[PDB]
Amino acid sequence: ELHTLRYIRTAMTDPGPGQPWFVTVGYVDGELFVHYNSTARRYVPRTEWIAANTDQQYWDGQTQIGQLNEQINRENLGIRQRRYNQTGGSHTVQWMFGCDILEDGTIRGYRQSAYDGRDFIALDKDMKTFTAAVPEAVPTKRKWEEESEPERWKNYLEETCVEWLRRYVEYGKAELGRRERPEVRVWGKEADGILTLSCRAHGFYPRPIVVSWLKDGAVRGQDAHSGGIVPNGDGTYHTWVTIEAQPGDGDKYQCRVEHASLPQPGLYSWK
């Protein structure tokens, strides 16, 4: 803890070429563990631990939950387009929901939706009502509140979501609690007369990390540029920070990498 469970849903009129129009993927503590799409018509494990700690019930049920959501989302695409007076084109429904369990026993939840990449509607903090982000979502607010949708999502988020998240974290404790050391490389090709120094951490886990440039031993932040944290294909991450120097001042710069996996912070020069 903190521990998180997150589901994100995409429903699109224009995927497109050999791509599924409907997808749902689940993440525990920010890592992919579950996948469903309209081509497969099947939920599948994406980590060894989820597969090893569930029975066939789990997959057959989730699969049919996925197939059900597929029909509901087909209609919702239709409904939102009509609200927006659309008769064609690329459009998308997005759902994003889940729960957090904070180290302190306190939980959190959120249920929010977008249309064409913009806020459409969401359950509000007290989980008693929905707040439409656009006028087109107003009839939806009215309908759901008449149908006691908020209460139904209060239960899912505060009980169902949390209880299952407890099971998941327990299943994949070892995997989620592991550490993987980044290999770091510093490099500086140039031209146009500027020495561009780059420092890259490869395959670190968990996610959090610090990669900084030092100039005369002093951290040169204001002007280093980061690509942020981007994922590898194996549940590890990558980051890449650059800085331009004089061609010759190269020897004055050092990249420093701090990570939980490291015996000591890495400190590396160019060349």
Binding site: G61, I65, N69, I72, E75, N76, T160, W164
Partner: peptide, 8 residues
Amino acid sequence: IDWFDGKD
């Protein structure tokens, strides 16, 4: 676990 959406 995943859960079912309501109808818009």
